[PDB]
Symmetry: C3
């Protein structure tokens, strides 16, 4: 029975940015058309230049953020070009049936498939490859995961009948990576994903990542690729982790409104220091910036954040508020008449 709704093609953009969309809409349901192209390729994952045999949707880790509204249909063309070596598919945690779509989307290199799913559940959700068996974790931890956001048609709210609107949105995809090492402790390089598999599975089995990164590599969102904001902006930070828990924290800020389980039918929590993304989910936090400067956005296992790759920066422009915080006295020598025992 043909579905007779307007169609809208969406052009995806690379994370941490997000394709243009409306928060609140008075448009009715549409068939929102997306295309995802699998790309297997070697990628650089840390500041020392370590390479890795990655598998991606659309060439990025994470895959791009898709944004639709409650009641939309999402029609995804998944493409597996013949330059790839492996079968792939896609499972939407936002979707109902057929293992999230995985059981309807298995494609060999040289094939494509078209899946439609109704966006009946609001929130942010993981999508990921899941070919079957041990290939499920391996494809996911090789990079084949992203997220989709299903907004209410009226946009976000605080769970107490007040509208919330963001000025800016970023998508932070966190990736646990399992890179083999040689006898001397150095990371091993491989010429294909298949050649990396046996050694990689051994590291995966011990459940300790070698790298934990945002946007696919250590330092991806620091330096010149810091995330911009301004004092007074309400920023939505979507965070996903398809395989492993995370505990996001904005250093020098808070989560004003946080959906840590990521589902907008639930009221957000207020004023959090650190929140929790259960592996296999996306969550989201709003924050209104009150102070200029550098903020570091981390998982608050600080070992993961500083030593395994999992730090991003915000650079925030505006005027410093000395009422909220001030340096009363700059560093100075301890007074000779001081005690301090």
């Amino acid at each position: 029975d043909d579905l007779k709704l307007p169609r809208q093609r969406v052009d995806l953009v690379a994370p941490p940015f997000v394709h243009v969309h409306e928060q609140a809409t008075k448009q009715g349901p549409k068939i929102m058309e997306f295309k995802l192209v699998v790309q297997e390729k070697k990628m650089v994952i840390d500041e020392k230049g370590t390479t890795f045999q990655a598998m991606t949707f659309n060439g990025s880790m994470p895959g791009p953020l898709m944004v639709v509204h409650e009641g939309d249909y999402v029609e995804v063309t998944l493409v597996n070009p013949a330059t790839n070596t492996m079968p792939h598919n896609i499972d939407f945690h936002s979707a109902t049936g057929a293992l999230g779509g995985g059981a309807l989307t298995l494609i060999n290199p040289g094939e494509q498939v078209v899946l439609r799913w109704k966006a009946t559940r609001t929130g942010v959700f993981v999508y990921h490859c899941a070919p079957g068996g041990p290939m499920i974790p391996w494809h996911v931890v090789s990079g084949m995961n992203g997220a989709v956001m299903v907004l209410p048609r009226d946009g976000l709210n605080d769970g107490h009948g007040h509208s919330l609107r963001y000025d800016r949105i970023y998508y932070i995809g966190e990736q646990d990576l399992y890179v083999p090492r040689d006898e001397k402790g150095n990371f091993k390089s491989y010429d294909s994903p298949g050649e990396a598999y046996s050694d990689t599975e051994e590291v995966m089995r011990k459940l300790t990542p070698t790298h934990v990164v945002f946007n696919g590599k250590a330092g991806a969102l620091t330096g010149k690729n810091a995330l911009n904001a301004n004092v007074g902006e309400n920023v939505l930070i979507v965070h996903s982790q398809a395989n492993r828990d995370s505990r996001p924290h904005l250093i020098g800020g808070h989560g004003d409104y946080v959906w840590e389980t990521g589902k907008f039918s639930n009221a957000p929590e207020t004023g959090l220091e650190t929140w929790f993304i259960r592996g296999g989910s996306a969550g989201a936090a709003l924050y209104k910036f009150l102070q200029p400067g550098i903020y570091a956005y981390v998982t608050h296992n600080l070992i993961e954040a500083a030593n395994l790759g999992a730090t991003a920066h915000f650079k925030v422009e505006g005027k410093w508020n000395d009422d909220l915080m001030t340096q009363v006295k700059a560093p100075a020598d301890i007074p000779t008449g001081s005690t301090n025992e």
Copy 2:
């Protein structure tokens, strides 16, 4: 001062099934009588036939689910037959006092004990053995844990004054196991739990399980022992983990109503993708099936799920709903006029 209430003897059944019970009841408080028999025995825990020196309540991992109502008294006869080698006891996280009952239930082989506890707290709760000291984790991770559900007398509700009723209930007990390996990496076999202890404690200390299983073994709830349901049924899935965190996910479904901390005085969250069972607790999720077919129920550390044992299946009978999801175009060769870069 004798407690003068009606007595009701309950016959426990092996997980993942649950003894017969009422959801809502107009019966008053009763003394609900249960018997648990400790059994130490070698068990098979994975598809390659690895054996393990297990310690169980009632012969199963997990121990059986007990179901009572708020205000009932629970009178448990714990039996430690003389064929066992170790002292045992029981701690109910549902109970108040004496380390959950552990300090009143320590029995040598050849002894039994009778504990009564008042069911003053609603929810699903872990029970486990806890003899003292290092024996506490060892007995628990050897299999000596289960759960108890304390229903409100009016049954479940959504926290907004609406009754929730399940058509079916399953109890998923998740077990982290620590099996020693020899120099060549093969799992070691032992002739008794005591002989396994020193090598097992060394694996336990590194906090990385070798196996993570549902119902006591990899593949326990797949194949012919898949969990049955039908389209339209509201299914309650109780999940426990006595020692280690888990992140349950129903692949192709959702948690319609989830008590991830497991306590029915709290409103459930709605529409979750993945939830979180903190080690040392039970949680519960309701889901109304909307689509037929195979569903995989996992912890969403997919390495744990696919490679360490932690996958169950549901087989759901009914009619496919092409409005919720459809394969618009089956796999086909990528059109020659396609781009895709």
Copy 3:
């Protein structure tokens, strides 16, 4: 523009105790003055006498609990005596701007600094050292973390317009430690923190602690240093973990009211068995004791609790309530006419 409020100097006390404070207050905003003195020193961390090159605020692990009210200003003098070897600073997760204060408080040995932050966010919050880069996790897991509580001016409430008042408060700081071992498996000793660093970082990278302790060492809060309470007392248990998740559980009790994300603008959950402290946060639980005796307070990874150090005790005085729990029959030989198969 000078801040013209009354000043109040607070004398900090060593955990698990808490400096004197008011729950509800009709005092207006004050400038609450605290001093923290960094101390680098070797400390004993387990029952076998293992030593560790620790770095502390005020000589303790955790650092002391600070208590203020919403709207207060907190003026902290941080002192780094010249006997220390390292630069240090402080990041308050309660504060807004400048990386929580870290970017305004970096002091060399021989220096002090004065930071003021406005207590605009209610809850319990972590504070920790964070000098930069890999020094951030290393200073934190070396012991440089504590917590601050920002009470509402009206004190705590249940989120449903009812006042909650504690009779007693304890602060449980949980510390993950990473102690190197030699070839034979024995813990290594070092003459300075700098000398320990390279070997310690290698252990940190594998993300598995060697020790998980409350109040700085295994057994700190057992034996003669058990935590006292009485039947009928409402006890607030503040729990922090600056780097790694925890799952607190009071064995033989419950969490009557739990703020597991730790922020008093959110209603607490009721009747929990086990709660979850996300690494990089503090949470809090109220419990009214109903039974006398020993209670064990653990993280409910029981391996961590029994074998890595993470057990505390409460010793509770009062009268046993046989309605809540009773030993119906003491241990006895299994009756000869029993079955039990």
